[PDB]
Design a protein around this nucleic acid. Structure first.
Lengths: 158, 314, 226, 155
RNA sequence: GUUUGACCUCAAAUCAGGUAGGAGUACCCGCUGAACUCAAUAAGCGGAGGAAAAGAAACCAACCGGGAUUGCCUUAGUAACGCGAGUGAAGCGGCAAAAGCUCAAAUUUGAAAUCUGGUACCUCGGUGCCCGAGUUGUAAUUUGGAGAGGG
RNA sequence: GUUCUUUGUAAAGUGCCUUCGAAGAGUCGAGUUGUUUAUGCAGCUCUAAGUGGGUGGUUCCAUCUAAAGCUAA
RNA sequence: AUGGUGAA
């Protein structure tokens, strides 16, 4: 599949092709608003391996955050604030700049009947998952919370 | 009240479709708001939008290719408007007197880029039913032979429709688009009017028709004042239109034999040539007799004699 | 500027048309001589003879843009059917019989009807005469009574009878009629017209087909189509 | 400045050869949803009242098109230039060259997809065909793969 | 063929189908965080449910191996630190309950087999039809305990 | 228990023979600067491997497959 | 110190 090659191509980010792509896309991202909808993910392999699908109900956003709290979590919270009715399942890096960093975030609509009608994603419609990014329950949030594995008063009646 | 442009913008419908909507409904002064509001609620707007969407989707398919999609995409009548403008059948008959002139004119127009052959065929066929019905109830009362044509007046339940029959000569060819909409509306009205008239006549509708006879004359002799010319049979010379003479005689109850049939009680022969070799009579005799029921003998209309002053019967 | 494909296609079509015309003419020359000893066929037949019969002919467009060939072009010029969608009535004869094959690919022929002839005459008609560029329609019979009528053809009905009954004045009237320019089928372009033309073109292949055989039966189709 | 690996597109097949390729591809347009549905309904009706050669169609889906590639099953590969994610198609010409498979580039992804029903197709390929495929492949080679074999140069 | 439509993007709707604000806040999840080492305490900010969170190992283990997560006893007031005031755990052991697993990942290509919306019937939905989403990937088949093709 | 349906060259499992046979990147890691009860997190330059890599103690051994996610008790 | 209140 193309993803097998896309992953390896994206691995060598310092390569000339990706260096040119990043500097081409940085200006386009800057000309856009702080938060704007993305028709398609610029890194389809990353999104697809992150559980994103092109079926109806899935929405890709992009957001710019100043450089210099975790940037990923801040971006997720910022996109969730504007996208109140959407759930920020996950986010990933796409481009970085000297003054700003760009992280792509994939949103899943729980109200859409398509998302509710499939068993592979209906779990996200539960009220427990509301504002998932707010509580830092995402991948970036869990990592920031330090949820690692391993080392890394009470009085009874008698 | 709102301006015509303001009303169009409110309806957000191009002027081409607004013309059709107004013709179907009728709006005029600058224009009263209530009429525009009533028009906006008409279902015809939805059908027009559907037609526009169909056209744009067809264009999309044609540009993309795969003509099969365009062919498969191919899968109405203003009945409600008829009731609104014609609350009752007598009202429709009353409005016929001026509405059907357009249809009768279109019945003889030539096919061109501005008018599809189907429209002309439908207009001609509508005449084949109108004349057939009129030749059974014998409602013809006037036959004024005017320069514009033979001004027929059929007593259609006492409204004396003033429909005019254009001459069979080529009608050499204005914005036909409005004329096309008027013709479509009049044909939609004619469908129901003819259905009602045929049902009233007691004949099963649609009745059978003969096509071999149509291939010979193509007209009233197919598709299956009144006391005049009872059982009379007339021979028509090569200088008269059979389409007009035959209809009047058939309505009167007689019969006609065409000279060009291969191109007895023969009381009269209609001839206009100065040379002749049956009671020879000019065509004016039949018209004069029908106009007043005179049933005057042939002595007053021998061929070659001075024509009498035919005053207009109105 | 014109792309190469057009020139090559025109050349290929012209070669085939010229070969077919030459073969048909050579076979007809031997058939007329009545030798009929080493040819495909000598008799003639029509399937769906050279006996008299009034037929209507319509000039159809196509085939591909073949340069005007001498034989067919001259034959059409005799009937002055160069313009597309033009038709004229001709008296069928044994001498005229090979002309059908000579100009078969460009025209369609058939047996008309009295009603069709009457409708065509009464609905269309030209009199290109008195500068005399006017295309005056048969508005009145006065022109027919004056210029015509020497042989007794005084009105339009007389012309109809002569055409249908093959009268003496058939040649005179037919030339005077200035044969009619029939309207084209679709007569449009744009959103609906493109699809309508594409749909109509399919019937052309199944109706206007040329077998190219030297002994091909005369192609005939009912004139009731139009 | 674009790197040598980029700008391989934009320089695409000529007008005449591109038109010939489009015409050839139109001869093997995959059955559309409506046609497939009606054919299946007809087959069901025939079976319900009272075994065919393998079909042929153009390959368009990127995943399965690449799957056919590397296996040497792709006789010809056609790629769009205006694809938004360039990385999806940057490596495709290189893979085709490495595997020894003819490849070509075209301008307009939508025009590429118009011959395969879908709105867009990015890339397209053919698995089977009658005999004009060899001539088209030779023309594409001599006009793009050998005439512009220096694509690795320039910037 | 200077006409055109597609695809991509940017806007509008008294258009149709949808959702977030606020309140409560004992418990819970993150940010920020003051003073008598005090204290990752209090207040403040944002978000949720009946529990929240975590949860099926890049874990602990140096054993004759255990084997999702969380609570209790014990480990233990021990290891360790500031050796000084004070802070301060964790494996193993016993108790109550135990459940599994899903996608990226290799060709469905002899058939995008997937699904949202509108409409006509019987209605926590199903059927036919139409459109749209989809190929820059929607169903089944595979999630390391491996797994797939065949006989 | 009672029933109307059960199906279409439809689905699954198991032992034998054979051929094939993937793994979450500005991520682990590393240096620094702030926080933390000398673990972790955060800003930042660098940022890689797949008979590879993470954690440990003895002359290199034991276990696991991270950088996606759901789950009552 | 935290969070508010008001004034010339």
């Amino acid at each position: 599949g193309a993803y097998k090659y896309l992953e390896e191509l994206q691995r060598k980010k310092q390569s000339d092709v990706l260096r040119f792509l990043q500097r081409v896309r940085v200006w386009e991202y800057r000309q856009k608003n702080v938060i704007h909808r993305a028709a398609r993910p610029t890194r389809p392999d990353k999104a697809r391996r992150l559980g994103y699908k092109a079926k109806q109900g899935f929405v890709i956003y992009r957001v710019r955050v100043r450089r210099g709290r975790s940037l990923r979590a801040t971006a997720e919270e910022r996109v969730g604030r504007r996208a109140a009715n959407l759930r920020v399942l996950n986010s990933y890096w796409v481009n970085q700049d000297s003054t700003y960093k760009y992280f792509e975030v994939i949103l899943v609509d729980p109200q859409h009947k398509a998302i509710r009608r499939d068993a592979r994603y209906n779990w996200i419609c539960d009220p427990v998952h509301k504002h998932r990014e707010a509580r830092g329950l995402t991948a970036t949030g869990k990592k920031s919370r330090g949820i690692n594995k391993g080392h890394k008063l009470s009085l009874w009646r008698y | 009240f709102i301006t015509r442009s303001q009303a169009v913008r409110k309806l957000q419908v191009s002027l081409a479709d607004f013309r059709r909507l107004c013709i179907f409904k009728g709006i005029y002064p600058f224009y009263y708001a209530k009429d525009i509001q009533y028009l906006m609620h008409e279902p015809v707007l939805a059908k027009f939008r559907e037609h526009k969407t169909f056209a744009r989707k067809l264009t999309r398919a044609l540009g993309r290719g795969e003509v099969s999609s365009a062919k498969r995409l191919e899968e109405y009548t203003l009945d409600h408007i008829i009731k609104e403008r014609y609350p009752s059948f007598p009202d429709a008959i009353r409005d016929i007197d001026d509405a059907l002139n357009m249809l009768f004119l279109f019945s003889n127009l030539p096919s061109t880029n501005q008018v599809s052959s189907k429209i002309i065929n439908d207009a001609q066929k509508i005449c084949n039913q109108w004349l057939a019905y009129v030749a059974k109830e014998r409602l013809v009362r006037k036959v004024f032979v005017s320069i514009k044509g033979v001004y027929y007046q059929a007593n259609i339940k006492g409204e004396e429709v003033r429909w005019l029959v254009p001459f069979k000569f080529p009608e050499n060819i204005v914005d036909f688009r409005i004329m096309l909409t008027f013709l479509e509306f009049y044909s939609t009205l004619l469908h129901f009017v003819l259905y009602k008239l045929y049902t009233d006549s007691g004949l099963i509708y649609p009745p059978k028709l003969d096509l071999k006879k149509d291939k010979i004359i193509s007209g009233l002799s197919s598709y299956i004042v009144a006391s005049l010319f009872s059982a009379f049979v007339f021979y028509v010379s090569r200088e008269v239109p059979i389409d007009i003479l035959e209809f009047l005689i058939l309505s009167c109850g007689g019969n006609v034999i065409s000279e060009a049939a291969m191109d007895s009680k023969v009381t009269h022969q209609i001839v206009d040539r100065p040379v002749l070799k049956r009671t020879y009579i000019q065509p004016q005799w039949i018209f004069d007799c029908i106009n007043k029921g005179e049933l005057v003998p042939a002595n007053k209309y021998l061929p070659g004699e001075a024509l009498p002053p035919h005053l207009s019967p109105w | 500027f014109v792309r190469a494909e057009s020139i090559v296609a025109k050349t290929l079509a012209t070669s085939r048309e010229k070969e077919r015309i030459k073969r048909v003419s050579i076979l007809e020359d031997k058939k007329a001589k009545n030798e009929t000893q080493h040819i495909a066929s000598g008799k003639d037949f029509i399937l769906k003879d050279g006996k008299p019969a009034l037929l209507f002919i319509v000039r159809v467009r196509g085939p591909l843009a073949v340069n005007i060939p001498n034989k067919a072009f001259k034959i059409l010029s005799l009937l002055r059917l160069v313009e597309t969608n033009t038709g004229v009535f001709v008296k069928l004869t044994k001498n005229v019989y090979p002309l059908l094959k000579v100009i078969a690919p460009y025209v369609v022929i058939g047996k008309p009807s009295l009603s069709s002839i009457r409708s065509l005459i009464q609905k269309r008609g030209r009199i290109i005469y008195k500068a005399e560029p006017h295309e005056i329609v048969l508005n009145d019979n006065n022109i027919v009574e004056e210029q015509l009528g020497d042989h007794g053809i005084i009105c339009v009905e007389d012309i109809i009878h002569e055409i249908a009954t093959m009268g003496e004045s058939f040649s005179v009237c037919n030339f005077f009629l200035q044969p009619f320019k029939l309207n084209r089928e679709v007569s449009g372009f744009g959103s609906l017209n493109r699809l309508r033309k594409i749909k109509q073109r399919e019937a052309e292949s199944r109706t206007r087909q040329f077998s190219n055989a030297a002994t091909a039966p005369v192609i005939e189709v009912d004139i009731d189509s139009l | 400045k674009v790197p040598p690996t980029i700008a391989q597109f934009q320089y695409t097949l000529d007008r005449n050869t591109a038109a010939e390729t489009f015409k050839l591809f139109n001869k093997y347009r995959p059955e559309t949803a409506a046609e497939k549905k009606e054919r299946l309904t007809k087959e069901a009706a025939a079976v319900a009242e009272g075994a065919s050669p393998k079909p042929y169609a153009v390959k368009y889906g990127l995943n399965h098109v690449v799957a056919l590639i590397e296996n040497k099953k792709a006789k010809l590969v056609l790629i769009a230039n205006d694809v938004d994610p360039i990385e999806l198609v940057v490596f495709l010409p290189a893979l085709c060259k490495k595997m020894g498979v003819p490849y070509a580039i075209v301008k307009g992804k939508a025009r590429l997809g118009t011959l395969v029903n879908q709105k867009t197709s990015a890339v397209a390929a053919l698995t089977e065909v009658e005999a004009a495929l060899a001539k088209l492949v030779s023309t594409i080679d001599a006009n793009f793969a050998d005439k512009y074999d220096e694509v690795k140069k320039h910037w």
